[PDB]
Amino acid sequence: AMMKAAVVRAFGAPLTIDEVPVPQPGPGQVQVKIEASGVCHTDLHAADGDWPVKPTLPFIPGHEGVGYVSAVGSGVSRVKEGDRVGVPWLYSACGYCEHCLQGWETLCEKQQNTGYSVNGGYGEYVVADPNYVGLLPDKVGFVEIAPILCAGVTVYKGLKVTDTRPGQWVVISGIGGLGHVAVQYARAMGLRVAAVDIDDAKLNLARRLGAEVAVNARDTDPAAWLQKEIGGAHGVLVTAVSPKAFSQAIGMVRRGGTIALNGLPPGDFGTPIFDVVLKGITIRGSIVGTRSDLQESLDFAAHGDVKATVSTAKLDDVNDVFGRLREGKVEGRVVLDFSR
Amino acid sequence: AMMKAAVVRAFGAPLTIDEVPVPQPGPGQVQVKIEASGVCHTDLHAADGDWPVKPTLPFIPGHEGVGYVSAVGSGVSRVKEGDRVGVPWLYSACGYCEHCLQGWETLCEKQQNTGYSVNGGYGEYVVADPNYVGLLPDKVGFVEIAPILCAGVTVYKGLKVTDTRPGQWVVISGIGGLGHVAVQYARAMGLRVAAVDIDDAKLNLARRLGAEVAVNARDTDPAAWLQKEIGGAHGVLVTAVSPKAFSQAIGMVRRGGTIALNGLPPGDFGTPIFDVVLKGITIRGSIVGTRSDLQESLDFAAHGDVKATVSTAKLDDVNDVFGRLREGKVEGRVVLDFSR
Amino acid sequence: AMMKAAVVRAFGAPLTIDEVPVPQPGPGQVQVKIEASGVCHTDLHAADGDWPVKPTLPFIPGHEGVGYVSAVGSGVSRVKEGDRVGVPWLYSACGYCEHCLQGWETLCEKQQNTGYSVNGGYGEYVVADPNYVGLLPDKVGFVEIAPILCAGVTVYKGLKVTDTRPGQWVVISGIGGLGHVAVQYARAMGLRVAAVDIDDAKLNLARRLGAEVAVNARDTDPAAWLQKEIGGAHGVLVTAVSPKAFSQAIGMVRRGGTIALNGLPPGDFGTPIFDVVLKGITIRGSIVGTRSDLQESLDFAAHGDVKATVSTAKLDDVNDVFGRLREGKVEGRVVLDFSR
């Protein structure tokens, strides 16, 4: 069989929509027929090769792909034909290293990554390791659930590692794909939410989704504004694609506070070490989520606590989507629709 | 009515040994007769007034003073005349704020600091808040115990917040004033210790103190070496916080590990986003510790698990001591001896 | 000079409403004019003289008393006259023992207890230690806020130590004074709530307050019912006044689950050690709440996440109230109203 897929063949170049072979599932593998496929900013980073560790060319991006198990190899019991599943960033892990045994498989040094080191969901079919796919809730459709496969799980875990508790203030910096669902997860976790971005439309989105307070960093110093407004936050989750937002976030927290980092813009960010030490601040990188994180994050969507803001696009228009996302002209998430 | 003391009357100017009034305790206060008083780099910064918030002039430095309770004001029960106590960095906290109520008095924004914002232990007597003094162990001398009020509790708390466990690997970065004490706490906390420095003398000291591994970063890349040799460290205590140490720490820590920063350097440090996020690294600021932190750290000294390298000097020679410290000629810690 | 107050002058006997002197505050003390005063089930035992350690006669019960500071002793800074305050079970703690230094003053062995070891709020005025009173929010009435002083802060802390997190199930056993507000805190902390009691009306109250499911332990074996309905809970908070309910709670959790204990019926409860060990179960006593806990719990009420179901009664009818409480004829809390 042949299939349509969007392929990266050179960093910086537009993706090409080509006919490629349908991947077949070997032993212990499953095949997934894609019905929807979220566009993550990471996909831009990957196609631009602006990260230290590059994807091997060529490749098909996409780690927010969801659909049906359309075929099953041998020795597979976790899922069966017809099951609704998603294939996330964490494609697979070794399962027995120290990290994996501790239930921190997101840290597995032997992990594979969907739509980066292996081909992803920007296509009609994708092969997956059934041991690491998301098991989708029956009551949420493909288009709405797709973003939870990365945006959702990531910020859910990110919020967990801020070490904030119900009643406390958390700041979400960057109300994009990750950010806009981050606001919703925070409320579901009993947190009071403040939002920071550089575009009023984003802040308006945050306001609708539960943000009690919101500030535009292009209009004022957000750190100073937040210190005055709420006395500083107990936690911050940075999803912004700007190193500047990382530095600013550090000045947003109360003493003893924690800043968790999701965003992956190239380079360093300026860190006021003196204040971090004097104020006992924690800065903490968070990387997607374990299978347990993933399952829990899907359950919040299933219960209606989190609903992704989504607009659809066609596979063929993937380069336009990339352009819009790059220009910050996307509200929430774009999901590629493969439905009939 | 009068006592000798080393007084800062102008930032940068030599301290003068003056006759000044013995401070007398009012209600809820105590008086301490100093037998020994530790010196460290923080005293230089107080005397130079080169930190963001300066001491008020004139003032008596010293946050490592130890001695006997020589008099009490009314309504004191925690201690009595004749008790052996130290008057550490945390002179007092408000006791009512969110931080104080949570047992994190070190983060109190209304805290006072001994030998910085109030008069300290560079004198024959000092008035203190008995609610915040350290209660000293019987079986350890004043001179030997003094540095535990600072270096001790600092590296102890710092090691605690790396969130490591017995059997796990911790790197002690820098085996100087703080580091040589740190190696001892780590060993007593059941940690496997790797010492990193640029000086073979200090690395050999580390080995004497129980370091299982020692690597000289002048010759070899401590990060590459440790990742290979022990798979990276679960924790990293950075006692000399320089850009190189900071960045090498990020390289030495294994994924999911924690880096605790034990120093107050000037300027912003470039923090690499990609590495912190994808390695799920925690970077945590930590200096001194709470009252309970301090008592716990003293217990280690009392049981002979921790002993600071100490040399004595006279109060009258403090300027000479400051000079030696500035030039980096001080091995271990210098302690002013008030005993006849 | 004189005030009205319900006094316990001999155990097991009716309380006598008498005129007694008004207590005056000395140094470090404040006087409080009572506006409302919650009746805790604990008060029944203070008066029966029921417990291992008994109050001393004669005494005035009541540790849910709220009102205004009407007089301030010497050396008090935390509060001033006119301040809205409440006087909880934890009347005072020593402030410097190991527990107190760790922000666990509820464990202080030198603590005093309001309406037990010292006189409480079943009277027009009560003297308190200003360092341990609750600072009440302006936007909640005295009658509604009164239960938060014990019922509220207790179950809030109890829920904290179930070690449950958003999305997970918690069971509230006993939907009384503590229980009916526990359901609400649970919801505010992002938990899904199941309710257990022995009276359909109390279960219906839980449901109206946010309980998703409910079971009458008189009608079926709760535990088996809960294992079937929700697959066991992640945590349980037991406020019930029956040892039986403690034994049943143990069987209500998933493996790895935690049961927190608040209720204080006399004697032992049957514990299946074999299952507790095989299933890795945790059983944990929880004792009111620290000042931090209390302020946090008052905040939930201030924001309207929590609202006590209360009936009022006159001080003079306190014996009638006791009777009804003892018979389980009370809906939520009864609060003594001193409103002129």
Next chain:
Amino acid sequence: AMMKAAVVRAFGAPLTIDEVPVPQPGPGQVQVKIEASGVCHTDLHAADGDWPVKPTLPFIPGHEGVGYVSAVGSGVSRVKEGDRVGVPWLYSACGYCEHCLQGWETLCEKQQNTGYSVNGGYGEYVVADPNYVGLLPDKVGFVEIAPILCAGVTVYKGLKVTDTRPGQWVVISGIGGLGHVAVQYARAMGLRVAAVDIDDAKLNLARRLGAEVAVNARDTDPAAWLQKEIGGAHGVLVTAVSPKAFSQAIGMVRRGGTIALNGLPPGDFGTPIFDVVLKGITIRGSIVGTRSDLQESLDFAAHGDVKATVSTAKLDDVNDVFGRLREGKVEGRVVLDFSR
């Protein structure tokens, strides 16, 4: 084709040493050649059908088998022929449930148990799940390391879940098979150890093992004595879970402390509600541990920190070994030696 093995063919009856087929490994399985095989009280309960859920007959007991990997089915990468491994209590788990995904495979409700629900190590060979075998340290012999698969990991994990930290007091209740090993882990974990038993010889053993204090409960009340002498222990490990040990544990622990139960006794225990709640005490069931726990516990043995008292016996004499066990004649641990 054939091998010797001890088989339970009827509950209560002597084991019969038979010649049975050597088990061959299918895909995902490995075969282990046994060199040593630990014996403990759990084997008695397996042989007696003593417990609620019984083994199926006939079966080969033994959950402490160690040896070489002698054959490797298809799709195995964790281990290879010649690898020195152990086949502990947790033969396998489902790997997909809530518990397995969270790194708590010990709580898997679909787990299989070696030498209980599947054939174990009381034979020359045994087939195992490579994903769940213990990877044995190079420097420790088969006989010495065998008990660590059981007693070792149990007491290590048990100590971990006391939530104590270095410098803090831990009580080891019972210095027998589990206890003498627990004392060693405790010291290596930096804990101050108080040993409690009723046998002076076992108490002397504890002291020589590093116990700082030892109380004989025949002659003195250990609760009152320890409360007076060390202000209660922060943690208590109950290795011999009898009602008396349980109740005394509750009296020995300091307020806020944690009691970890390491045994599987019959029947309900009377738990004092008042003491547990008022003292804020945690009671916690813990036996064996995860794969991560086992590997950590194995490292302590590899470093010389922990050594089980071991004596050997032959497979043919297992019934006699059982005899001694039953009568309580066994000091330390007995290990079957299969070596030439």
